[PDB]
Each structure stands twice: as structure tokens, then as C-alpha cells.
Paper text:
NAMPT functions as a homo-dimeric enzyme that catalyzes the rate limiting step in the primary salvage pathway for NAD synthesis, the transfer of a phosphoribosyl residue from 5-phosphoribosyl-1-pyrophosphate (PRPP) to nicotinamide (NAM) to produce nicotinamide mononucleotide (NMN). Crystal structures of NAMPT in numerous ligand-bound forms have been reported. These structures consistently display a NAMPT homo-dimer with two essentially identical active sites at the dimer interface. Typical NAMPT inhibitors were found to occupy the portion of active site responsible for NAM binding and a tunnel-shaped cavity extending from the NAM binding site. Furthermore, we determine the crystal structures of six NAMPT mutants in the apo form and in complex with various inhibitors and present a definitive model to explain the differential effects of the mutations on various structural classes of NAMPT inhibitors.
GNE-618 is a novel small molecule that potently inhibits NAMPT activity and exhibits efficacy in xenograft models of cancer. H191 and G217 together with D219 and Y188 form one side of the tunnel wall surrounding the cavity commonly occupied by NAMPT inhibitors. This proximity suggests that these mutations could directly interfere with GNE-618 binding. The H191 imidazole ring forms a herringbone stacking interaction with the GNE-618 phenyl linker moiety. The same interaction is observed for other bi-aryl sulfone inhibitors. The stacking interaction defined the orientation of the inhibitor linker moiety inside the tunnel passage and oriented the inhibitor's terminal group to exit the tunnel. The optimal orientation of H191 imidazole ring is facilitated by hydrogen bond interactions with D219 and a water molecule (WAT), which in turn interacts with the main chain carbonyl of Y188.
Residue numbers in the entry:
A (entry chain B): 8 to 42, 53 to 486
B (entry chain A): 8 to 43, 53 to 487
The structure:
């Protein structure tokens, strides 16, 4: 079972001994440091607060366990047993910490304070940065949500341009990343972050995360439809690809169905199998139940364009009010190979150049959506800015000579609206001067309790694109 | 509680309706597909997955109903195979009728070889083999962490041996700083455990408990750390009192090794004036078993390491070792823990060698580069069906996409063997049955809900040793 005394970087076990004597306060903050990705979606802290930080997180057993582990890990006794016991005895093991944060779903420019952390008991000065490691993991849902939203912006631009509206936008980028992430827990967190922006997911783990920690009015936040994989095609034998196709589309005759078509020869499959042999089974389908053809190999742009050209000669294509080509409503394409933010952009621009509407296509993204991301992308960072020692408050910061980009903010921080309606972070307690109105951070955690929270429905609202608004 | 019925890709819920009728067996395999460097991979991590997620009673009435309810809304349709899951519950008390055979954990195997196979043991459960693709394929992560970590050990070993004449301290030269930089607590434990296959230094505490619970070691713990500052414990003293912070910290930890980040304001000043003059007397008095380890944390990693060494070499008594390389006094060492991945690690040690500094002088910390900056595409980790039985006839199956030969999959029943020259070969089409190639290196590790063969972390470390270490 999870032990918060074992959920920090090893060296922080030794930090209580290193602060100035008589330090009563350590105040720290998190930002996506400024140096693409000019704004970030703040999402995922609520999960962390609830799963890991709230309530009785310290017990006698947990203290003894950490002591026993650290004795061996350090080959020495450096663990702060006394400090953790104080929390257990004084607060029934509830963390005497206060955290303030911007609302989940908020879209905030880089280099602003997103959350702050401080101890509420002078004895627990060391506690603020003990929990740095767990809190900093919020980088992941923030970065997934942010990158997913940037992709939605691209899709919106091109869908709007080639079709004249945004119908179907929230189903244009589907999460295929379950197998390509590093763990079950990561799958749930990452999938939920993608769902801030879209409604299509195969990463089932995200649904229960959202239900437990955020909630939606709707029964579920994300959806899928039947689809083949290579095994359900290839199992029929190399000479029976047509039979597999026919069986699958007949099994799923009245719901949407996606069929991967590149097991042997994508171009043959589109031109001869779907386009001729089984055409009669496709042109009969409901607009509510298209066949969605899936290529899965080759150059992503070149393959998409060739697949569309093939289908456009076998099926009745129309020209929409914008002058772009549209497959008939019972036939669509999904490209779910090699898709990341860069290749997504190359594909939609390439389709636009060849006069194909973005209405024709959806994208699936796995590793690119959920795994190919690091803390460096948005420079997510947690730093101490204020301490009280001998009763005196001091504004503190790092400012490395060789890299101004790593300079941290000083003193007590607050978030405000500027006269033009943008965000500004005020340093050095200047928020107290009340020249910039009220602090936009809310207390979300205090003394073991979650004090403010957001539904997944409100997070989605906060995260909307300007174009959608 | 974890629900295996909710731990697959959505579309796999619909696959039981798509296989050929009269199919009794689906047999699938996992490989790190050969591309067109990472020419060999460390197989590690399956044992964790088997124990945490696959073994024992994993199906219950409540879990089946839960899945039914979720999928009804997720698909806006009733597609879920309730009958198939009920069958497993009734006939096998909720244990998976699956057999998995795998190469021993720790084994180092060239790309394009079978690492494990999966098949159903009951004809009714043909659909189950690929249901669990999603959870099994996540083994890509500990494989890739272990492999990339080992490739870094090879670079360190080559340069340590060249500049010092031996491998002393190699197992402590790449420390895991990745706890905060990975995507979740679970990922942290798994990734940290995989790094420990190759090294002994970690700050990612989560790895220790995973190893104890799922693998085990003779020693109390698999990994170690030592006291160290962070920017907060320096900056809290105030900009004008960096020296006071340094003095306080090395005095607190005067008898153990201690690392002190030195770039809060001016790394070069800190080394030349603070460590090299003001506080020199507190450094030169230290034990060889308790050095000060100076940590820069910004600037160009190579340029900064070299300049730091340049500065320290002029303030402290440096010797020339028997290989002609410069060596800091035993009480003074350096760790570079910013911007390190396999590429920059290589650039740093080669740069050090060019400037005649022994690799003895330095250690590396890696966080995101070590544990997060990896994907399934690095080693092309992939799970594919190679054999099915339909109407009682076995057929060898595969994909072979016209526009990408690299994605062609293997055919039929597979086995892994030693070649006459002592290398590895995967035999396809059941050809291992001909017995021309000695015994199958795959062992049954899971069968019908039970883990049937396990490895200790000690055995895994042994299997994953570098050739240079063996020699
Ligand atoms: O095809 C897969 N999953 C099913 C699937 C997902 C997404 C689509 S879609 O065309 O975007 C689509 C169409 C209509 C409704 C929805 C809706 F509204 F439901 F979202 C989604 C169609 C089918 C699939 C394929 N390959 C994969 N690799 N790894 C995971 C994978 C998942
Ligand atoms: O300094 C940090 N951790 C403590 C630490 C780790 C590793 C070393 S080391 O020089 O490799 C070393 C020296 C002697 C023994 C060991 C031994 F045998 F114990 F492994 C390790 C010295 C100190 C640290 C620094 N920055 C970080 N960012 N994110 C996580 C971080 C952790």
C-alpha cells in the first residue's frame, strides 16, 4: 500500500537537516517555465490531492517501514522519524500543508504561477519540499492535455477551412495509446487528460479515473466503436482477406466499423476488395454506420492521399460548399500510424492542398499522444520562493549564470488579471498592494482536506478553444 | 480494485465476433522488431505484470457486471462478450486459461527474436489471447529502460576502462534522478527497478519496494543513495549566504559522501572562490569514503563539466594516473545531473577523454532521459498473432504490408534457440519440433492462472551483465 514517506526522491530525506536553523516556513510554487506551446492547460492536480495527499496518510506502521527502508538505502540513520511522528500525533497523520491553485481546465500562458505550497505548522517547514516529487508529476497530465489541445487547434483550423464548420471536431483525434504508455496508472491519467479535449478513446482506464476523481453528468466521458485488428484479418489466411472483410462488416452492419486494410496490400484492399468485390456491402450502409478504412503503414501523408485517390475513383465523391471533395457518408478513413502533432499537421495541410475535406478523415494517436512527452516540453518546475527564518520573511530564488531561463520567481506569488484581461503573476508579495484586484488562485488543499474541486464537465468548459467559444 | 475486463483497448472488446468461425486457438508472440542502434535488448518486467495483474482469480461476477455497464455506455451498444467471461468464471474459478512462455528475465537477446509467446489453453477462450495484448505489451517499458540503461553502462565502461585501467565504481556511475520526471507513481517504480538491473544508485524510492515484492534480493535493498542538497536548501539561506549554506551542509554530513548543487547563482564562482578558497579547509580534510561531490546543474553539459574540472584542478592537488589521465583528490568528485541522456553522456565522456580527465572523476544523474524519454518505437516492441487453429487445422499467419517490410511479422509456432556459434535464432513454422537446434530457451512462466517460473533480482542482474564485466 502507498506510503507517502517512501514517495519522495531519496535526497529529500536529508533536507530537514540543511535549511537554516529556526526556519518556520517554506513556500514553493509550480510553473511551466517560459523559454510553440505558448499556453498550458492546467489539469491533474485534483487526482493527486485525492489519491495520495488527503486524509490520514501517516501511520505508525508507515513510519516504521520508511525508517527500516532508509536505514538500508542510506546505510545510515538519517530519516526524520521525529518529524513524521509529530504529524501523526498532532494531526492524526493529516498533512499540515496549504496548496493554492488555478482552476483545473484553465488555459494559462507560460511562466505563470499555477500552484503554490506551504506548511501551516512551523514544525513542518521540511514538509513543503518533501512533497515536491509527487506534485511535480502533475507535469504529465498538464502536458498531455496541452499537447492534445494544440492538436485540436490544428484540426479546427483545417476542418473549418475545408468544410465551413466544426462538426465532428471532438471525434477527430482518438486515443490509441493504452499499450504504448509506461504503466496502467499512466494510461488512466494520460487518457483522462486527452479527454479534456476530445471524446474518443480506446484507453479504457481513463473512464474510471474521471468517474472517481472528477465526474461527468454523462454516464461516460469517452467513446469507441467496433474495429478490426491485424489478428482478426490475418487469422483467416493470406488468401482470405476478402472473407474477413465481409464477415466483419456484416457482423457490424448497423454501427460504425473500422477495418485495418494494410495487412498485405492497402492499395489492393481499397481498389479491388472494398472498391469492387465488396462495394455492394459498403454503399448500402447508414450515414450513422460508415465503414472507416484504416491504413497502418507507409508514409502517413502519401498513404492517406493515395487511399483517398483510390476511393474517390471507386465511390461517388461530392464537392462540398467550400469546393473540397467529400467521400459519400457511408465511407471514411482513419490514419492511426505515425501520428503526432507534427505529422498531423503535415497530413491535414497535404489533404487541403489536394482538395480533400478534413471531414473525410480522423486520426488515432498512441505513443505520440500519451508517451512521447517529457517535463522539458513545457519546462514544468517546482521551486522555493519564500522562507521565514528567525521570524523574518526572505524572498529567495535561483539565478544560474549560464542559463537565465532557469531563473526562478521571488517571494510570495499571486495570479491576477491585467487591465487587458490577460494573466500576470505578481512576485514579492506585490499582490497585497491590491493594484491588480483579487488573486486568481484558490485554496484547493488545507490540512489534509481537499477544499475546492472541479467536475470534468467544468474542466472541459474551461479548456475550450477560442474558435469553439 | 483493478478489473482485467476494463484493462484492454476498447476495440478488442469486439474481436470475439471477428475471428474465423470454428477457431479454437490463437497463438501470439512479442518481439523487439528489427529495423532497417540498440542491437540487443534486456528482457525484464514480465514477472511484475504476471503477478500484479494476471495471476489468480481475476474474474468475478461483480467485475463482469461492471464491465458490461461501462461498455454499454462507451459503445452505445451491447457488444461485450459476457458469455465468454462467464465461462472463465464458472469453469476455472476466474483464472485465465492462458499459457505464456518467455526467455529468462535478464537475458540479453538480439533484435528480431521471440521474447515471449501467448496462447489459450481452452478452445472456448481463443479470444482471450489477444485481449491481454494491451497489458502484456506494456512490458516494452521496463525492457526499454533496462536496455537503454545497459547501453549507457557500456559507454561508461569503455571510457572508464580506457582512462583508469579498470571498472571500479562503474555500477554507481549513472544514478536515477527520474522520480519527478515520469508520468506516474507506478511508472516510477517500474522504471526505477529496470535501471537497477544495471546499476546500484537510485533516488527513485518506489523501485525498491517493487523489487522486494515481485523479484527479491539477498541484500536488504537493491539500490542506494547519499545525502545531497537541492536548490531550496541553498537558496533558503539568502543570496548573500551561499557560503554559509555550503559550510552548514558539508558539516552536517562530514563523515558520509555528500553532494552539493553549486550553480544557484554562479557555478564557476562557487567552485573557484567558495569551494576552492573560502571553504577549502573543510574539503581537503575529508575521508576518501566521504567525498564532497560538486553538482553543476545548468549550462552546456559538456562545456560546464570541463570548465568545472578545469577550475577544481587548479585549486586542488590533481594527480596523473597510470594511464596518463588527470585525477582529482579522493575527497573531491563531480556529478553532472542536468540534461543527461545516452547521447549527451557519450559527448561528455568523450570530451573528458580529449581533455585528459579520467572518467573516475565524474558520475552522472539522469531523470527524464533515463525513465521518461523513451517510447515503444525505440526497440519496435510488438505483439502479433502467428498461429491459429481453425476447423482443427493449424495455419501459419502473419502481416506483410506492401509499403513497409520492416513490419512483416513471423509465421507459425515459434521457438528460441542457441545457434552453433552460440548466438540466438528464432525458428518459425514449428520448425523447433525438428530438434535440429537444441532446446527451446522459452520457459513456461504462466499457465492457467498460476505463475510457474520466477526469477530473483539477483539472477536477473547476473543475466544482464556486460561482456566487459564477464571478462
Ligand atoms: O480502431 C481502433 N479502435 C476503434 C476505433 C477508434 C476510433 C474510431 S474513429 O473513426 O475515430 C470514430 C468513428 C465514429 C465514432 C467514434 C467514437 F465516437 F466512438 F469515438 C470514433 C474508430 C474505431 C484502434 C486501432 N488500432 C489501435 N492501436 N492501438 C489502439 C487501437 C485502436
Ligand atoms: O543528489 C541527488 N541525489 C543524491 C545523490 C545521488 C547520487 C550521488 S552519486 O555521486 O552518484 C553517489 C556517490 C556515492 C555513493 C552513491 C550511492 F552508492 F549511494 F549510490 C552515489 C550523490 C548524491 C539528486 C540531485 N538532483 C536531483 N533531481 N532529481 C532527483 C535528484 C537527486
Amino acid at each position: 500500500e502507498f506510503n507517502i514517506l517512501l514517495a519522495t526522491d531519496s535526497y529529500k530525506v536529508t533536507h530537514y537537516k540543511q535549511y537554516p536553523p529556526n526556519t518556520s516556513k517554506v513556500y514553493s510554487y509550480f510553473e511551466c517555465r517560459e523559454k510553440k506551446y505558448e499556453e498550458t492547460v492546467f489539469y491533474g492536480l485534483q487526482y493527486i490531492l485525492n489519491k495520495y495527499l488527503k486524509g490520514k496518510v501517516v501511520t505508525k506502521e508507515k513510519i516504521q517501514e520508511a525508517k527500516d527502508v532508509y536505514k538500508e538505502h542510506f546505510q545510515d540513520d538519517v530519516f526524520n522519524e521525529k518529524g513524521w511522528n509529530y504529524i501523526l500525533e498532532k494531526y492524526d497523520g493529516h498533512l499540515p500543508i496549504e496548496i493554492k491553485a488555478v482552476p483545473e481546465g484553465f488555459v494559462i500562458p507560460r511562466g505563470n504561477v499555477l500552484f503554490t505550497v506551504e506548511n501551516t505548522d512551523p514544525e513542518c517547514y521540511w514538509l513543503t519540499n518533501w512533497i515536491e516529487t509527487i506534485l511535480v508529476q502533475s507535469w504529465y497530465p498538464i502536458t498531455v492535455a496541452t499537447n492534445s489541445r494544440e492538436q485540436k487547434k490544428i484540426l479546427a483550423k483545417y476542418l473549418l477551412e475545408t468544410s465551413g464548420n466544426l462538426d465532428g471536431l471532438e471525434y477527430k483525434l482518438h486515443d490509441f495509446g493504452y499499450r504504448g504508455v509506461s504503466s496502467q496508472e499512466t494510461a488512466g491519467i494520460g487518457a483522462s487528460a486527452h479527454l479534456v479535449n476530445f471524446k474518443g478513446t480506446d484507453t479504457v482506464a481513463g473512464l474510471a479515473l474521471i468517474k472517481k476523481y472528477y465526474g461527468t453528468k454523462d454516464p461516460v466521458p469517452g467513446y469507441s466503436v467496433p474495429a478490426a485488428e491485424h489478428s482478426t484479418i490475418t487469422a483467416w489466411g493470406k488468401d482470405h482477406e476478402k472473407d474477413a472483410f465481409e464477415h466483419i462488416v456484416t457482423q457490424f452492419s448497423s454501427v460504425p466499423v473500422s477495418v485495418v486494410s494494410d495487412s498485405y496490400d492497402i492499395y489492393n484492399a481499397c481498389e479491388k476488395i472494398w472498391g469492387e468485390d465488396l462495394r455492394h456491402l459498403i454503399v448500402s450502409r447508414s450515414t450513422q454506420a460508415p465503414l472507416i478504412i484504416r491504413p497502418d503503414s507507409g508514409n502517413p501523408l502519401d498513404t492517406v492521399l493515395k487511399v483517398l485517390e483510390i476511393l474517390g475513383k471507386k465511390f461517388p465523391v461530392t464537392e462540398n460548399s467550400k469546393g473540397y471533395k467529400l467521400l459519400p457518408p457511408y465511407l471514411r478513413v482513419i490514419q492511426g500510424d505515425g501520428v503526432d502533432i507534427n505529422t498531423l499537421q503535415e497530413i491535414v495541410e497535404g489533404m487541403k492542398q489536394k482538395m480533400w475535406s478534413i471531414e473525410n478523415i480522423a486520426f488515432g494517436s498512441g505513443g505520440g499522444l500519451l508517451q512521447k512527452l517529457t517535463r522539458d516540453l513545457l519546462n514544468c518546475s517546482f521551486k522555493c520562493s519564500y522562507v521565514v527564518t528567525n521570524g523574518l520573511g526572505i524572498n529567495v530564488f535561483k539565478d544560474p549564470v549560464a542559463d537565465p531561463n532557469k531563473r526562478s520567481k521571488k517571494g510570495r506569488l499571486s495570479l491576477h488579471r491585467t487591465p487587458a484581461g490577460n494573466f500576470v503573476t505578481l512576485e514579492e508579495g506585490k499582490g497585497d498592494l491590491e493594484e491588480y484586484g483579487q488573486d486568481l488562485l484558490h485554496t484547493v488543499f488545507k490540512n489534509g482536506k481537499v477544499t475546492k474541486s472541479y467536475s470534468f464537465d467544468e474542466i472541459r468548459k474551461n479548456a475550450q478553444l477560442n474558435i469553439e467559444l
